[PDB]
Ligand SMILES: Cc1cc2nc3c(=O)[nH]c(=O)nc-3n(C[C@H](O)[C@H](O)[C@H](O)COP(=O)(O)OP(=O)(O)OC[C@H]3O[C@@H](n4cnc5c(N)ncnc54)[C@H](O)[C@@H]3O)c2cc1C
């Protein structure tokens with residue numbers, strides 16, 4: 001049947017969008033249109049071809065986290081007998097950004113190669129918006145009276161417009177920055193305030209701390225008692241302690257009430273406790289909400305809810321049968337590899353014939369803090385709620401190399417959460433160098449329903465930090481009927 | 490029954506010995522005597538309380554590998570904008586050794602605490618030798634006419650005397666060093682020749698290369714075509730290439746015929762090809778044979794064979810019923826965690842009542858080369874022999890951070906070997922930073938009989954090097970009836 005210009009229009013050329021578009025085009029010879037707002041990373045729109053991850057997320061972030069680590073690694077080299085002037089050690093921030101821009105730019109460039117070279121896959125630059133269930137309009141600007149560039153007549157629509165940082169909404173909010181603006185800063189700031197206690201706040205605290213000029217400092221300021229909500233409690237306390245030792249002042253039960261601009265350019269910040277303080281820059285990392293607010297979803301009749309989240313079934317389908325939505329715009333787990341899996345499972349479902357729903361349980365993630373976190377599965381707090389009897393295995397050690405490096409604060413931590421019944425591993429929570437690498441392969445065991453038996457029965461790899469997974473036999477303590485107990489009934 | 494001084498005498502206070510001794514003593518309240526030749530690391534005997542691993546193996550080696558990495562890491566920091574004088578960058582070897590000695594010393598010290606503090610576990614310093622099946626004699630020196638220090642009357646004997654470096658046996662052999670002597674060298678050598686192509690040769694090449702003074706160099710000289718026999722062929726070629734780029738000259742089908750001492754202290758080395766060359770030091774790493782040659786095993790009638798290996802059944806028992814032998818002295822897999830498992834499984838078998846034999850299949854190990862290797866299970870060469878149909882998955886990439894670091898030679902490599910029949914994963918072979926950490930948890934999956942299905946069905950952790958395990962769906966090529974084929978019948 002030769003009806004409609006495109007089989008599939010994809011709003012958002014990000015992690016979810018491109019996977020879907022590319023699969024649909026090459027493996028199922030479908031005609032696929034992919035809409036995004038710019039082809040290259042940067043202000044004023046930030047996101048681009050490749051999406052948030054490539055342009056202003058996972059990729060550039062980890063490049064910069066890697067950069068800031070050299071501060072620690074250079075300190076540490078001295079114990080191993082690397083004499084070299086430590087007074088001459090101020091990192092050049094401009095050289096880092098240049099390098100990071102070069103790398104992101106080459107990815108954007110390799111995505112233009114993809115489109116020109118791949119048959120039946122076209123890229124449409126502007127602002128997508130629905131008109132009906134079968135029509136997506138592309139505009140110059142997001143202002144819905146902007147000149148219309150293209151009207152894409154399509155059989156299926158896939159909404160993959162991702163998410164956008166949330167603002168603080170107080171007198172002074174417009175003088176603060178976010179992840180987006182942080183990546184283009186001309187100079188590393190001397191006096192830096194990271195507002196928030198989520199993984200972005202923490203990762204960027206670590207970056208700024210590494211790239212701070214001589215005499216500078218980083219405060220991390222959080223609404224609540226303990227940073228990294230929904231992470232292992234003892235891992236969060238240990239990281240709080242290690243950010244401290246690395247020179248990051250963590251402040252809790254603290255919220256800016258007001259920001260005003262000083263004469264030199266810096267920002268005055270009033271807080272809850274009465275305290276006033278001056279910062280060269282103030283970065284809000286207080287959450288990310290879906291971008292559905294300009295897609296005019298009301299017009300097509302696709303179902304919205306909790307903060308513009310696209311209401312979606314297991315197979316990613318909206319209220320309208322031909323319109324699907326994946327990634328951060330759905331407001332489930334906001335990770336790149338999830339969106340990629342949802343997009344892959346969308347093409348298999350609709351165009352493959354072979355239906356599949358993404359599996360959201362025990363998906364491993366990481367925090368690229370200094371030091372880093374690797375986690376997969378559930379905290380002991382939620383295990384003790386959903387499970388009769390729960391064993392908590394726990395082990396903390398300092399790798400011998402830190403007796404030499406001077407970094408004696410760098411406790412490596414592993415906690416495993418069990419179902420007593422059958423030994424099943426419900427959660428693994430690691431803090432320390434290499435954790436994100438180790439957890440990936442933990443995530444495979446946990447997928448295969450690994451019991452604690454399966455860990456301690458594995459011959460170890462010496463000397464390693466991971467070999468301590470296979471040395472955890474005796475539980476530290478338990479939970480029967482969701483209350484902590486010294487020992488088991 | 491109150492008969493015999495000790496339930497158990499353990500010749501060798503190493504990885505195997507101490508595990509066995511300690512388990513027997515605390516968990517089974519047995520009376521345990523542990524014999525070793527000195528309580529502290531160092532010349533002229535090197536090994537000590539804690540064994541080869543703690544004193545002159547895994548532990549000090551990795552400390553020094555960690556040290557040498559700083560050479561690369563400091564180079565790499567520049568791309569991320571770490572300005573600092575690179576002309577002022579010669580590592581102080583004396584500071585490294587001091588530090589490494591401090592660390593090993595504290596372990597030796599913590600093992601004396603263990604003995605004094607632990608009831609029914611005594612330490613007997615000298616040279617063990619059998620007299621009969623129930624009597625171990627301890628002598629001042631290994632000369633079997635040395636003054637006798639103790640006669641230990643015992644019900645069970647456990648031989649855990651480990652192994653010892655092999656010599657080259659040519660005119661000049663006595664002027665060369667080994668792993669043992671390398672660890673106490675007063676100065677880092679300017680012109681270093683590592684003879685051998687085993688993991689020790691390669692790891693030490695990397696150390697010397699990091700700690701070489703200004704203008705110095707390291708040659709790695711190997712008998713055969715390709716270093717690291719019994720490793721993935723494409724991993725060995727890739728590492729050969731990366732040692733090259735890191736400044737190590739690899740030489741193959743090359744063997745020293747003769748070494749003589751020069752006037753200044755250096756060594757003249759004649760080779761096969763006719764070539765003569767001068768080296769400040771020459772380190773032989775050409776294999777390790779059991780220490781059974783002074784235990785006078787002939788007297789007790791315990792069965793020897795291939796190079797003094799103690800002939801042993803699955804449960805570690807010698808020809809004599811009450812005498813067992815574990816670790817490198819058996820000449821199976823010569824790794825610390827194996828010996829520890831054999832010792833643990835000896836105490837459970839004999840003293841526990843609950844018999845168990847160590848499982849030697851798909852045990853993950855690592856090479857602390859620069860860059861490092863993580864491997865578990867079988868090469869495609871032996872898979873293609875023992876299996877009808879074999880799939881080989883393979884992927885090589887350069888992490889984006891090396892576009893910035895300048896280290897563009899640092900290809901990260903993963904190869905998986907499958908049984909086509911059922912998808913089972915028979916082998917995983919990784920080269921690159923973090924590999925030894927990643928392989929540990931691969932070793933758990935492979936223990937649980939993971940299929941390739943189980944890998945690619947796992948949501949990935951972004952951005953990571955390990956997430957490329959879960960992105961390998963299409964085999965690179967196969968093997969039916971042990972011959973390589975482009976594609977499958
Ligand atoms: C600072 C930061 C760090 C992160 N680090 C990690 C990490 O380490 N690991 C990880 O797994 N995840 C990480 N994430 C999360 C990751 O970026 C997202 O989960 C992922 O990008 C979501 O993919 P998506 O397909 O939902 O949308 P995106 O990848 O965000 O793609 C959405 C695209 O839609 C476009 N778009 C928006 N509106 C329109 C419109 N009207 N018309 C057309 N196009 C439009 C945007 O320009 C954008 O390019 C990070 C996120 C941030 C912000």
Ligand SMILES: Cc1cc2nc3c(=O)[nH]c(=O)nc-3n(C[C@H](O)[C@H](O)[C@H](O)COP(=O)(O)OP(=O)(O)OC[C@H]3O[C@@H](n4cnc5c(N)ncnc54)[C@H](O)[C@@H]3O)c2cc1C
Nearest residue numbers: 501503504505536540541546547617651816817823824825
């Ligand atoms: C340089 C090097 C690096 C290594 N790196 C690693 C690594 O990274 N990972 C890994 O898993 N393995 C590694 N190994 C291997 C590891 O050291 C051995 O596999 C392990 O130590 C074997 O333990 P064992 O119990 O068999 O004996 P050992 O640990 O060697 O203990 C034997 C002990 O017996 C004592 N002894 C000898 N003869 C007598 C006697 N007559 N009387 C009394 N005592 C005696 C010795 O003094 C010694 O202390 C390495 C080995 C070397 C040499």
Ligand SMILES: NCCCCc1cn(-c2ccc(-c3nc(CCc4ccccc4)cs3)c(OCCC3CCNCC3)c2)nn1
Nearest residue numbers: 018019020022026106107110111113114115117118119889
């Ligand atoms: N007519 C059919 C045959 C067409 C055949 C065809 C391929 N390309 C083509 C073009 C590009 C890419 C990519 N590049 C990156 C960025 C990688 C990068 C960039 C710079 C430096 C280092 C690394 C991610 S993806 C690509 O990968 C396919 C996978 C998918 C994964 C899901 N997302 C989209 C890409 C295929 N050009 N022609």
Ligand SMILES: NCCCCc1cn(-c2ccc(-c3nc(CCc4ccccc4)cs3)c(OCCC3CCNCC3)c2)nn1
Nearest residue numbers: 400507508509511515595596599600602603604606607608
């Ligand atoms: N009467 C019964 C109760 C006795 C109770 C009792 C314990 N100790 C005791 C004493 C020592 C150690 C060790 N230390 C290291 C070295 C660790 C180290 C050293 C320096 C710096 C950093 C790290 C390895 S092991 C130990 O660990 C038990 C496990 C075993 C594992 C198998 N090998 C032997 C030790 C127990 N002292 N008193």
